[PDB]
Amino acid sequence: VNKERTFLAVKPDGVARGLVGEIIARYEKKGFVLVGLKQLVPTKDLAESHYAEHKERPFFGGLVSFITSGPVVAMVFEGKGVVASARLMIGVTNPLASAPGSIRGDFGVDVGRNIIAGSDSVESANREIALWFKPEELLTEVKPNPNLYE
Amino acid sequence: VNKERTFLAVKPDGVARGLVGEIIARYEKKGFVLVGLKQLVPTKDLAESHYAEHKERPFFGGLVSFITSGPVVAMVFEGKGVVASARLMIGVTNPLASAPGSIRGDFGVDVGRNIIAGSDSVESANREIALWFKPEELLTEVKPNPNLYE
Amino acid sequence: VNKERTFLAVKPDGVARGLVGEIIARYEKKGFVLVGLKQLVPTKDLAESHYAEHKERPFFGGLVSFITSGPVVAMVFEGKGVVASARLMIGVTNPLASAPGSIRGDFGVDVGRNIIAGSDSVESANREIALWFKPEELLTEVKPNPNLYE
Amino acid sequence: VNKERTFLAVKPDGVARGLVGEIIARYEKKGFVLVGLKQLVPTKDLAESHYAEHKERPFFGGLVSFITSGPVVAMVFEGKGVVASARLMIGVTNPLASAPGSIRGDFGVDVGRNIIAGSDSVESANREIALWFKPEELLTEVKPNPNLYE
Amino acid sequence: VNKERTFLAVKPDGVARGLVGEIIARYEKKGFVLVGLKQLVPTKDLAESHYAEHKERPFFGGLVSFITSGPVVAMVFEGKGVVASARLMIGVTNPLASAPGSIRGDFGVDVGRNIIAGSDSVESANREIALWFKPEELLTEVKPNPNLYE
Amino acid sequence: VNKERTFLAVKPDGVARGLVGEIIARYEKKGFVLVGLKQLVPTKDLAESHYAEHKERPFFGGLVSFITSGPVVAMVFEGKGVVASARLMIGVTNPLASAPGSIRGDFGVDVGRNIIAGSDSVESANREIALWFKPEELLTEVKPNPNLYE
Predict the structure, then answer these.
(1) Which amino acid positions bind ATP, per UniProt (chains A, B, C, D, E, F)?
(2) Domain total in chain E
(3) How far is E38 from chain C (nearest CA, A)?
(4) C26, C89, C149: residue with CB nearest B113
């Protein structure tokens, strides 16, 4: 189904480096539809909840500290297979090993400053969307270019 | 002063044509800082207030109808001379007469589908920002790349 | 009216320099619709007819010789004000004096190797289209993106 | 040998989405030479012949219907290993699984709207070129940039 | 004549912002030929000599201080009318008033951080080239693409 | 460590094709820092030393002949994992088999005209840097954007 949605966050390093527009344009060109979008400086509570799966790990603190250190651009994109497709467009965890053409492959060098993060599964996407966005902040009616889907 | 701000709205035609990222990237490359950003479908009340200066004119209705017909990406950019600079980057009212290199010059053809609109003066910017955005939706602390200003 | 058409020819120097795609993309992004397109090596008869307005001038021979020296990409674009708009996107006769952002301003240096030429008026466009293209080579039904025109 | 040729068709969805110039530019930058180019609306006879290998399959009808639904940009490119190289530049059948950097990976989302198709072998290329183009529509003498081949 | 040369320096702010490649590519696409190129951190003596025309003015000190504050990418480009053409591609002194499409118009905001500077006349170019480059650092034989000049 | 360095040379075919700026921009966008840069026409002695590992092979002569046939743009980039990362950004030896998104994948077609070459290991990088550049030609103090490294 064409209504799958994923959550993407341009982290503070991506915003600070002026990469927001470049990133959004890659998803728009692909044909995914923007369904939610806003810039905010995450609070500690929102960050700890977002990274809750890592809470027992040592690196949890650093992830929380970094994401609340500056503005973040949060967005929700809709489309067929968007969850896995957006991860492929992002690259792998280590930017140095990500292929040229991917966001991290083209712009990043360090695991801890890897620019953007997207949901890893439909289930986590559904959880993340509900955490970061109020229902009224998301488009209800979506209309993709008519030349994108059979 | 380097803290001047302007309000820009990517209208429904610009969002529908997948031009949001392209537009944001032009302002980021220029060195202006994103201070507010969100997508919303304007209500009639917000639209009539935004276009209040034209309320006695015949074309008022059409402007209100069009802007509430679909999603809009609202944003606030900060920087020296941003109000006039952003207008220059946009082009003139008629896209056909706008120079190649400007947003309307590169992407538009009709006055009524001219993609984006920006504040025409600091005073109108201040009014528009307060209409479209709550104070907590705007960054308070802004940090431009350190190589941009003397 | 939205059905005006203009004739554009990417000259041999533009084809040889690998600029065909770059040029077509500029008109597509603008919103003009491709209505005719083909590559051919012009015959002397077609060239002399195309440049017939200059036939009494000394430089006529050189224009004819150059345009028949290699492949040319001929195209017809449709849209509101396309004739004048396409000239503005091209630049002025001398590439050195053309503004950055225009095709000649961005890519050319010499009057005699100025990459592309477009019709100078609706009347000349109508004549040029009929010279270079058979009626069955042109789209009859045209459908522009629906977000381009009011 | 440097004179191998392949047939590429930008399908109706690619033309409708304004991707013709972007696609041609990718092959020009690569160093392949444009040897044939035209826009046409395929007739049913030409479509059934093009897709003749699938004629016994159920999905044959849909392929024929779609390709004759609007304009197509047909082209022939020449160069060493162009047949396999052009397929690699295109991506795999499913755009969602195509790598960022490839045409389908960057712009497509659905198998049935996958933008462009290229010959799968030299033999099929030779058949397709002869179907879509008359011999006089193809360049006989080809001259690649002199810095491309040893 | 096609052998005119101009001197361009990407100042410390341009180097620091990662704009070197973008700038060089604009001149290469235009058709000008790179005849000299190097990165160096200017010494005070070289800076005072470069800005010698302003030595009696108050702002002289600041120009000298800034240009010696970090790496500079110095280059010499060759081609017809390159001196005036390169200035047009750069924009005017104030980046805010420079047109979109020009380097300063697209990337700058402050007079004192205006990214790049080029020779203002053939005479000053000849002086600047001799100051910044040793004769053996410059190409003697130049070969422009053959499709650029008549 | 973040101070690893690699040597890259845009070969004569890359310079001749106007690809210098495009290539430098890819490394700048990635976040690597330019630490050395110059254009020169290699002497036979420098070439034979650069390709010394192949001196017993038949193709040695051709490599030496080609690299001394015209200008070369030599550069040194600094950053974490830059040696392997730059090779990945370049592609594989055969441009036809290099993935779209890589420099050779996007721009090349022949093994002998493969545009650019980078060090294959830290040890060879250290040798190549010392061969092509004098110590005073390299930046001593390097400052990467502060948003690149943790």
Answers:
(1) 11, 59, 87, 93, 104, 114
(2) 1
(3) 24
(4) C149
What is the per-residue DSSP string for A77-108? EESTTHHHHHHHHH--SSGGGSPBTBHHHHH-
Chains contacting D (3+ CB pairs below 8 angstroms): A, C, F
CA distance C3 to C84: 14
**CA-based nearest distance A18→chain B, Å:** 5
To the nearest whole Å, the CA of E82 is away from the closest chain F CA by: 16
Cα–Cα distance, C87 to C71 (Å, whole number): 22
Sequence-ordered alpha helix ranges (H) in F4-108:
12-16, 20-30, 44-50, 60-67, 82-90, 103-107
Q: Which of residues 99-138 of E touch B (CB under 8 A)?
A: 99-102, 105-113
Which residues have CB under 8 Å from B68's CB, separation 6+?
B41, B42, B43, B44, B47
Nearest-CB residue to A28 (from B21, B28, B40): B21
Of residues C29, C103, C148, nearest to B106 (C-beta): C29
Side-chain-side CA neighbours of residue D27 (13 Å): 35
AA letter at E22: E
Chain E nearest CA to F142, separation (Å): 10
Q: To the nearest 10°, report the CA torsion of D127, D131, D133, D138.
A: 20
DSSP C80-91: TTHHHHHHHHH-
Q: Which pairing describes strands E72-78 and F33-40: parallel, antiparallel, or unpaired?
A: unpaired
Q: Contact, D12 vs D70, CB < 8 A?
A: yes
- How distant, in Å, are the alpha carbons of A76, A139, B34, C148 from that of A34? 6, 8, 18, 20
Contact yes or no for F25 and E22 at CB 8 A: yes
**Intra-chain end-to-end CA distance of chain A, in Å:** 12
Question: What is the experimental resolution, given in Å to one decimal place?
Answer: 1.9
How crowded is residue F65: how many other Cβ atoms within 10 Å of its Cβ?
11
d(CA A106, CA A90): 10
Give me the domain span that covers residue C14.
1-150
* Separation of alpha carbons B64 and B44, rounded Å: 7
Q: CA of E71 to nearest chain C CA: how many angstroms apart?
A: 27
CA distance E103 to E91: 6
Calculate ∠ Cα E67-E69-E70, nearest 5°: 95
Q: From F147, which residue of chain A is nearest by alpha-carbon distance?
A: A13
The CATH number for E85's domain is: 3.30.70.141
Task: Compare all CA atoms of chain A with the CA of F32 and give the residue at the minimum distance.
Answer: A109
The DSSP line for E76-127 is EEESTTHHHHHHHHH--SSGGGSPBTBHHHHH--BTTB--EEE-SSHHHHHH
Count other Cβ atoms within 10 Å, centred on residue B3. Answer: 11
A18 backbone φψ class: left, alpha, beta (φ>0; ψ -120 to 50)? left
Chain D neighbors of F109, CB-CB under 8 A: 30-32, 79-81, 85, 148-149
Residue type, C83: V
Q: What is the DSSP letter of D33?
A: E
Nearest in space to F34 (alpha carbons), one of F71, F86, F70: F86
Q: F17 and D80: CB-CB below 8 Å?
A: no
Q: Do the Cβ atoms of D99 and F101 come within 8 Å?
A: yes
Which residue from E18, A28, A18 is spatially nearest to B26, judged by alpha carbons?
A18
Q: How was this structure determined?
A: X-ray
Closest Cβ opposite residue D101 in set F97, F101, F107: F101
Q: Do the Cβ atoms of A70 and A12 come closer than 8 Å?
A: yes
B30 part of contact set with chain E, CB < 8 Å: yes
B42 touching chain C per CB within 8 A? no
Burial of E124 (0-12, 13-18, 19+ CB in 10 A): middle
Strand partners, C34: C77
Task: Write the DSSP symbol of residue B17.
Answer: T
